[PDB]
């Protein structure tokens, strides 16, 4: 019975309310994202609870600009909040500099926002881990954040249920050199490793990032591609 709340350190350890938010992230819906040579592939795992829900209303894959994709693994109600913050911030950058914002500067400022919520002492942290990507100046990128304010840079990663198992498959399956199609193939493979047995044109939801810009794929080509891709 301690820590409680956000203003004071432990006797020796860490920030238990951030560790619990990370556990709530790890208890979330799975996702996978892979940086290839020319593009970046994002893929989530979106199961409706009943047969009643519609798949055209809520969207996991969400663009920040015309060339910057972003998925998560956590809670949509906080996700939309920090999405809207990132929207307004990226449009403020484009007001200041009249140039589309680079992804490193996005990740700096979004990390500053999340860090400002981790400061004391009445607000809770986000239960949201991001996977940010974009194609700025030829070389595409991939940046994962976390509730603690930190950030990383990945070649391919995963987040959600069985991220450890999916990551051990990613270490074996993926490599340095692929194209976007082979990236989607290995991405649906590593998401199909951990998802339920019935995977359709609606249970997944996939957006890509070519150098020609962000592209959020449709259920038509998603159903064409995952119609027993291997």
């Amino acid at each position: 019975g301690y820590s409680f709340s956000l203003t004071t350190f432990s006797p020796s350890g860490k920030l238990v309310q951030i560790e619990y938010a990370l556990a709530a992230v790890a208890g979330g819906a799975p996702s996978v994202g892979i940086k290839a040579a020319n593009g970046v592939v994002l893929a989530t795992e979106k199961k409706q609870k009943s047969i009643l829900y519609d798949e055209r209303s809520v969207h996991k894959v969400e663009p920040i600009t015309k060339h910057i994709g972003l998925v998560y693994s956590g809670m949509g109600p906080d996700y939309r909040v920090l999405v809207h913050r990132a929207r307004k911030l990226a449009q403020q950058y484009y007001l200041v500099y009249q140039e589309p914002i680079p992804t490193a500067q996005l990740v700096q400022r979004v990390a500053s926002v999340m860090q400002e919520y981790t400061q004391s002492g009445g607000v809770r942290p986000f239960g949201v881990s991001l996977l940010i990507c974009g194609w700025n100046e030829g070389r595409p990128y991939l940046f994962q954040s976390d509730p603690s304010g930190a950030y990383f840079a990945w070649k391919a990663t995963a987040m959600g249920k069985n991220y450890v198992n999916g990551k051990t498959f990613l270490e074996k399956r993926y490599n340095e050199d692929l194209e976007l199609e082979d990236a989607i193939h290995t991405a649906i493979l590593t998401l199909k490793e951990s998802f339920e047995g019935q995977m359709t044109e609606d249970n997944i939801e996939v957006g890509i990032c070519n150098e020609a810009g962000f592209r959020r794929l449709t259920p038509t080509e998603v159903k064409d591609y995952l119609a027993a891709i291997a």
């Binding site: 709530a24 979330g28 609870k49 693994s73 956590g74 809670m75 949509g76 239960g127 339920e196």
Partner: protein
């Protein structure tokens, strides 16, 4: 037991762990097996399908399949038939751990 806060300064150790093996629990594909074995103890009319509720996220850990079997078959013993309906599955999914449920489906 369930709670694991009792040892490993001495059970699972460098050197002591020669066959001291950690044992978690089974994945999906196992509830189907329990549904195959314990419902083979009853008579199984000839056609009341069974994968229709593994697709429900029941999570009913692997004793209470027999609780479903007991309450369901003996509810058919209120009719004293040995032959099984799908109504046994609804009455053993609204008299068993239908409490928590189902949902919550927020926050993932």
């Amino acid at each position: 037991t369930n709670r694991a806060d009792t040892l490993d300064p001495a059970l699972l150790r460098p050197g002591r762990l020669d066959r001291k093996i950690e044992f978690p629990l089974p994945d999906r594909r196992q509830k189907r097996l329990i549904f195959s074995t314990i419902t083979s103890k009853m008579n199984l009319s000839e056609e009341v399908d069974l994968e229709d509720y593994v697709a429900r996220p029941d999570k009913i850990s692997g004793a209470d399949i027999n609780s479903i079997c007991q309450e369901s078959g003996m509810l058919a013993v209120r009719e004293n038939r040995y032959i099984v309906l799908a109504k046994d599955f609804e009455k053993a999914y609204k008299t068993v751990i239908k409490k928590d449920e189902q949902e919550h489906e927020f926050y993932k």
